[PDB]
Each structure stands twice: as structure tokens, then as C-alpha cells.
RNA sequence: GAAGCUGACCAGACAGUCGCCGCUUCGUCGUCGUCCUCUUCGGGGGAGACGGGCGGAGGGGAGGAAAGUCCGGGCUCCAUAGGGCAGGGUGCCAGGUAACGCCUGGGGGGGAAACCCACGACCAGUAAACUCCACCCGGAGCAAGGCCAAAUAGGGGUUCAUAAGGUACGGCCCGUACUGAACCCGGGUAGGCUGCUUGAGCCAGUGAGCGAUUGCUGGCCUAGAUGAAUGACUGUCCACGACAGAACCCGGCUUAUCGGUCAGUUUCCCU
């Protein structure tokens, strides 16, 4: 089962503060990814995009949707970690294929 | 036939593998210390409500601007001697609306798309050049509050309540009872459910009004999420796809929009 239930998202900011105080760098000159270990056995991810970086509410939402579709497909492969995503400045200019390959280009060096 | 305007619709459809939400129902497991009857009452059976009570089934899920600080209202909480000053808005006539800086029909001028413009007394006093002449004008907001869970005083003062609080006017003073308040000796809901999508709606028939709009009769009810809900490759009538995001709701205008199909309208004149 490749479902994406409620127990796979960082709801409260406490998990965000935990990931911030225990971070490991894994970013590009465009997108930065952080994370930390947990204990539930299944990995969880957080979604944080800055409104000041890019406006246009169809954007940011598109980034969230693409990130969810890229994360929920590899939940049975990558180890159990508490991830978090952030979007920098010039990110809304890329299309879907470029963003997808850029997101899949980072998770290869996550051998933790 | 080419070019320019206004109005109407659209700015994708179909299938293509897994998934996110909420609506209804189906049985299923606990709680009822809910109800009723039998009972071994260690309780069982049935009816309701709640809980992740586990899956199945059915049918669903972003606009012509959802976007703005540009207006008006719906619905709550707080507050409010009646007397003015001060400030703001509106200012051709007549209608629409629940209201309006919104809509419509006339007149004057402006004039040609200035067929759109302040068009309230330039003499009542030297006016998209000033005073004034009338009407109106509390504040904050679905994190408003409402219901619960839960909360766990701090013996109260120089003692007066007058200038602790301009009490509310509140920008100002006339004062209406002008108002219960200093630091120790302070510790306290962080959660849940409703508001919440039936809309001062939509469609059809039929009168009224030059117009905006409306009288009457029938039918329709699958965004409401809470780091906050839209991805997959093949063909296509692929108009080769652009501006863009719901967050309590409604009525207008204000920006942004590649463009495609019709209707009306003018110039070009092979026609
Ligand atoms: Mg919006
Ligand atoms: Mg409050
Ligand atoms: Mg809306």
C-alpha cells in the first residue's frame, strides 16, 4: 500500500524545531532539503514555502503537489527520517519535468 | 474579402496507473455509569448518541476574475446624559436597490464617443479658485463569539470611588452617578464541537416598465481543507491551451489575461 495518511506530515512546529536543531545539509543552488532521525519506523516530511520568495498562489501550491507526489512514491525505500522542504528565490520558473528531476537528483546522496 | 470596436461562450476533452480530502449508506468493535423488558444480572436482546468503530459501496471536490483596501450590507462582542464645537462623506432632475462613491431614463453644458462632464446657491458673500447651504456618520471582527471540558482568590489597601478608570461622549469641553482600584502575598482552560456553505440563490413559463429591475406559477441542492486537499503516459475534433487560488457570506468596480468561435458595428472598394 502506497497510501499517504495523516501520520506522515509535520503538523506541529515542534517537529520543525527538532529538524532545525538537528539538521543535515542536502541542498542544491535552488532547493535545500534537511532532515533528522526519528523512532516511529516510517519517514515523515514537512512542507514550508516562503510567500516572499514567489507570489502567485498557483505556484507554491504546484510545488507542494509535486513534492507530495515525489515523496509518497519512495516511502518504502528511503530510511525513516523527518524531512522538511524549503523553496528559495527563482524556483517558479522551472517546469514539472525539471523540478521532478531536480528533486530526484538529491535523494541519491541520502545514504543515512 | 482585409482592418478596427462592443456583446455572448470557451481558454481543453477522452480514456491512460496509484493516491489527498470531505458527503450518504452497509454491516463491524468498544462507551453510554442513555432508555425499555427479561434476567444466572459476571448480564443478555432491541432502539438512539459518541468514539480511528475496519473495510467495502455510491456519488463528489479550484473564477470570469476566487485576486484589492476601492465602497455597501448580512451576523456577532463591547460601549453609548443630550448640548454643541471640530472632522469626514454626498451634493442636476426623476426611478432601481436592503443599501451604496453601484445601475437606469431624461434635461443643461460639454460636445462628438467630453453622448460624457459638478450639473449645490460666482453672487447668499471676490466654487473640479475660498466661506457657507442641506442629509448622514461608534469600534473590532468567524483566532467574533456560543457550548463544553476545565482552573486551582491574590485574607486586601494612606483607604476613598477624584484627576488608578478623558466611565461613554473622546478629537475637543458642557458634566450626567461622572464611574472599583496601586504592588506584593500573581499564576489558570492552551484541547474539542458548532458558526460552515440553502445563496438579500439557479432554471423554465408568464405579465409590467423606453430603461435599469420586478409582480405571479412551477421545479434543483456533492469545496469547506486546518503547514491548509489536483500527478501518471497513448491517441485527439491539440481552438496547440493564459490571467490566476476558495478560507463566514453577499451586491458593484479596479486591475491582469496567449488567444479561439458567433452576433452587431464602421474604414478600406478586387467584392
Ligand atoms: Mg481568495
Ligand atoms: Mg476574542
Ligand atoms: Mg468565494
From TrEMBL:
Keywords: Endonuclease, Hydrolase, Nuclease, RNA-binding, tRNA processing. GO terms for cellular component: ribonuclease P complex. One of its GO terms (biological process) is tRNA 5'-leader removal. It comes from the Bacteria. SUPFAM superfamilies: Ribosomal protein S5 domain 2-like. One of its GO terms (molecular function) is ribonuclease P activity. Belongs to the RnpA family. NCBIfam families: rnpA. This is Ribonuclease P protein component. The gene is rnpA.
